[PDB]
Amino acid sequence: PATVVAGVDLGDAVFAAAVRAGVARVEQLMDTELRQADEVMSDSLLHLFNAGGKRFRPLFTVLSAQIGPQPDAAAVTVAGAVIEMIHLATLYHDDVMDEAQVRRGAPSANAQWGNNVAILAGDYLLATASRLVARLGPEAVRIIADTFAQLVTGQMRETRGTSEVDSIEQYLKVVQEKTGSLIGAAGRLGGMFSGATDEQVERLSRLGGVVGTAFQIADDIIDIDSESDESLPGTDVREGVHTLPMLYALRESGPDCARLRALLNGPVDDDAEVREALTLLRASPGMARAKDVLAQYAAQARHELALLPDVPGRRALAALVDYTVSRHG
């Protein structure tokens, strides 16, 4: 609709084309950078890249930089590419870990080329992003390495808990680490290199981590009560991963919670069990307690973004937060 850029309606086509141009420049950079790789990477490298992505983080970086005097600064496009490359790397690695066959509506990188070619593809994304971020200076470099480290402890935290745990507190530490910090960094990078005041930078950075925690939580609710609008439904069920709505549903009481407690104990290979467990979780009070927490996070973000200056980028960010909790995929 030309007022929508990357799933988000921005109200105006003049403004949306400016943001679209910025998101388009983040993508030209990745397309340039990846395409320059040795012949032997090009299949796996562009696989997830060719097939569409939500483009959420390039948007968030671009929308954050709109809080600045030079939102179109070239260093913002660079920082916009670093963020999305790291995120792409983790999709290659996640899809091998979750043994996922399908990603972004296409064959997942590993279902196409096998686990090792997938792992390496992600590695090469990490190198490329490392090289890109060094262009932005010592502090940008420190930011992205702190964020990448904190991302991985999130992934490790999640894995440690599944192998043993069911702890809301720990889950909230996971989603903040494995998703929030990267968008936290993207907000901090777009504030920085668009020229926003130190305060706005901190405010945009705070905002990205909250938006990132929210976005992951909506992704875990979508995994349970969506039906093939995500990108395969109920993956958390099958992998025995216990996200927020399952965790609450297990703290529940009654015959339903009883069944779930035995179903969600470890992985599920039976298809007709996932259908039953998806029905149970979809109906549980646990799922509505988790929609609440989601809305609570949305409110922390809209509060954070309500103390940003009244500029079009503050409205645009507000629609992004709303999109983040209201979308269905």
Place this chain on the structure above:
Amino acid sequence: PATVVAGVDLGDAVFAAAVRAGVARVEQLMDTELRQADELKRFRPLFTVLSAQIGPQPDAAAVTVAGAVIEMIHLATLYHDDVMDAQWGNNVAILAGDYLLATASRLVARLGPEAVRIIADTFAQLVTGQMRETRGTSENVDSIEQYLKVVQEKTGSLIGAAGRLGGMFSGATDEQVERLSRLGGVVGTAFQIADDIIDIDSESDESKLPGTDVREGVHTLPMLYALRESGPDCARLRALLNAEVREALTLLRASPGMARAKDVLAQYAAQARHELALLPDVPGRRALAALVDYTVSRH
């Protein structure tokens, strides 16, 4: 023995001791840095610290940081190749490798953006070597030229970086940094050609199980040379190279292609020693000399 550090005999028990401290500082930094998330023979550490012997400040903290970053990237690639195509272990391969890259990312961030560009490139080269390898195997194709490119990328490139970073951060001159970098490039190439040669002559008590490259069908230099031969037992080895596999080895070790592979390891040795001769006449150049020899003559 007292004069041996990380497998290389440096002739001098006193120099080997100073080198060991450098290697153990690296080992200790890998310990303090890897310890907590919510709480995994040291050739590349050793190569870093010997490079830095050419510089004025061999013991610089930056040198120790670079040694750790190198070996962490090294290990991360080891974990990642233990991913096979059971999920519990695969997950531990990927994350352990990813936690090592994250921690290297943090450490190199302290070494600064030029040290970030260097490490980023060599990992990209490193990963490229692995793809070439992994994908040269799937096609069953057998070029010496893809294999030589493989080892320069997969193995030679990270030791190149070890010499360059040991060079810069010991305070070596610009010419010396690039010379160390060219050095580690050939040393890592040859080190890998020796690894592949070893896989066919070694035994388990004297190493890993032999012929694991044969089992996976990874065709290394002695193989690629041996497949080009024309003898009575060639076709037998042509077919065998897709526990009977113990018969491919015994064909491989008495092959003239194997001795060809050893000639080339030597030609890489000569190249590395010429790089060495162009360095200052200091004890560290001697130590590097002993490393080059150990690189091409172990088992």
